[PDB]
């Protein structure tokens, strides 16, 4: 309760999302772009939280980009978390300063050693945020504790291993 999230470069994922987001993956790991970054508030300064994110499955569909519009052709095929390095840490701390996870790595390998996070190429992702509650002791492992979930729509989009939309392939470019 009364804990709110804030999208940081919210209008340049907007830029994106108007196009149909697309990112890139590879075996070794890609870092995203836009950056997942957010401006938390509303923790209590003195409670210890565990920030982390996940990219789940956005439908059940896998896709193809074709006369320049994305196109359902079939179902997704058969299908890990990122938790934050400084977890856990006060609520003080993570108001302190916007909270990155431009640390995250997106990677088609089935097999990766890295713990980085395997995705489907040509499958729709959305990226969640979860806050973590420490128990009445302010410590973890021991009790079952209270999260909440973030979802910002806006930064949704499709792995590939190589851009499809000229739209995507130019905003890059002008932008990272
Ligand atoms: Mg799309
Ligand atoms: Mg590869
Ligand atoms: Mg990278
Ligand atoms: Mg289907």
Known sequence: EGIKVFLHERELWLKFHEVGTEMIITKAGRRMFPSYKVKVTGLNPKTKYILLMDIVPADDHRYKFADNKWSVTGKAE??????????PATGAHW???????????????HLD???????????????????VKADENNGFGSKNTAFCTHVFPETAFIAVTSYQNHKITQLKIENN
Do not use: E, W
Not at 113 to 131: A, D, E, T, V, W
């Open 113 to 131: 050693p890295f713990g980085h996070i395997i995705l489907n190429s040509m499958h729709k992702y959305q990226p969640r945020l979860h806050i």
């Open 78 to 87: 058969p299908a890990r978390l990122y938790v934050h390095p400084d977890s």
């Open 95 to 109: 108001m302190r300063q916007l909270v990155s996870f431009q640390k995250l790595k997106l990677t088609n390998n």
